[PDB]
Amino acid sequence: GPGGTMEKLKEIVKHLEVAIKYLKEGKVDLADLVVADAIELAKEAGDKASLEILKVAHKAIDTLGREGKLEEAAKIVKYAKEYVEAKIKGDREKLRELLEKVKKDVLEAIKKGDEEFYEALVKIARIIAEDLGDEKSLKVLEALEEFFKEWKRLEKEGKSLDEKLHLFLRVGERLLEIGDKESLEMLIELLEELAKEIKKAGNEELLVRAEAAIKDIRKHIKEL
Amino acid sequence: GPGGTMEKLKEIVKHLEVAIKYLKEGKVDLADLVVADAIELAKEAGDKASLEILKVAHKAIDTLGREGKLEEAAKIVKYAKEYVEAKIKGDREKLRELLEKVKKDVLEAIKKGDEEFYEALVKIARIIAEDLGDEKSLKVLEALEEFFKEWKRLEKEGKSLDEKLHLFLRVGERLLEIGDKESLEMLIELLEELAKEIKKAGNEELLVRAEAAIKDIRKHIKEL
Amino acid sequence: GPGGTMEKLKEIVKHLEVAIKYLKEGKVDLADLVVADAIELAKEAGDKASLEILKVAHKAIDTLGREGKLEEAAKIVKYAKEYVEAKIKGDREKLRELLEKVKKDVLEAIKKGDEEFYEALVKIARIIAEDLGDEKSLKVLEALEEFFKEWKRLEKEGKSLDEKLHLFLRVGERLLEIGDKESLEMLIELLEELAKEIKKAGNEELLVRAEAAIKDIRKHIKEL
């Protein structure tokens, strides 16, 4: 009770609900103020775990909510509310499901190309994973971070396709060593896209390697 | 970065822009809440320099914004936003221009007679001048403070006009000693106003002194 | 002087020459005693850098010298003596050459398959590189450590050669990312050995991937 199972945390959940309600109709400044009030309440509970995710939600409001992407900040606020409400009940089996959903959206964001959504998503994933004693969901996070940053670096400049292919091989081997499977179909799709791009060009002796890589990771996914 | 060049300070700037937008359409309580949120953000950056000016902006909202003077609190919030944004870039040549504009506004307010605007402008000017290592723009601030307070004291009561004249000579000599120029033509205008008041009355042997004072100070400014 | 440029350090060097002389004629216990005396002397110099490498030399005597490998512990003690004598002269351009020789010996040991020599060599390399401010010579050391441990784990058990190929690709991508080229021809030779082993077997659809790997890595080595 008294800020350990209910009361203050229930107030935070109610405020987050009002924030989502405001977001779903368009008022972004009011939702930002409500999230600031929720952060002020959380600073008086001595949790050190909900304060960070509420700050992440506030920053998500700032970035995504102000611009045209209004449905990507409501998702962050919903994840914050669900993380808090899975802590007001002392439930650990729900944090794993929340982390699974968060990781699926990080994969979706990487596949799409959203930048502002991705940072808040990985921040939430790290916060959940550091409070769950999970290390198989954090090294995948680091590998995806490196992959995304290096992909952006190569796409901004005009580097050749060989370095991008090397990126794909490196991240595929890293995830294969990890053993994660849900992060591998996205990489398979991206490798197929790169193979289609290469097939447009006349350069050879790199397409056979790419096709062999796709077949190998697909076979391992079937095994996994 | 991380609250030293951007991030938190950029959030403060964005909230200040939202507050000004709210002010230019009339919602004062929402702007007050936004400024309170900005103050809460600034309290988490450890600056000791933007927090005070944001508090001054909050008080300016309280005083001017709640009353009919909606264009004089938007000015304070704009000055706060510009001071913060001239600090997120590490620019010192812009703080001098901001101080010049603030001092011009102080002189305009003293010429008009605004009381709530005057205190906020003086607080902003002192905050800027205590961070720029300037002592020429502070002694003139003290002289104008004393001049305004004594003017209000004489005008509230029924003191004789000779005391007002002595006040005028005293402040004119003080500003001549400090060497400031932009603060002295306002004194000339006030001296002409008092001379016009004197010429209305039949009392003599004090008006020629007033004319000589105006001519001498005008000649000194021409030299200045 | 007095244990900072000469005296005690020259005593240690002379004892190291005596240790080499004993090792080259066969007396291993006497060389071990001499190295222990040198360690005792170094403990009275407060270097914190020569003591560790002398301990490494002592352990190398213990392991390699006791068995028939008498030419592999003399090399370790020689490297220790050269490291000390390159510190009695205040020379930094010689530590780089010593690190080059040590890394070349690490590569030769990995290619040959020696285990006791390898650990002493990487210990010496780590001690030298932690006193030279080099980070391009440490990540390659970590990659080679992981490669050797995983290679031994695969060779001891009855794992399939597909995981061996995955190991090869992984370490090749890591070495390409760091950019080291002198550690890559040993990997080239091991990859050709694995390709010859695969050609013995009738299994296909993995030989083409391997061959493309050698071609690509050799092309990159030419570029490097």
Ligand SMILES: [Zn+2]
């Ligand atoms: Zn806010």
Ligand SMILES: [Zn+2]
């Ligand atoms: Zn495979």
Ligand SMILES: [Zn+2]
């Ligand atoms: Zn307020």
Ligand SMILES: [Zn+2]
């Ligand atoms: Zn004069």
Ligand SMILES: [Zn+2]
């Ligand atoms: Zn011994």
Ligand SMILES: [Zn+2]
């Ligand atoms: Zn390549």
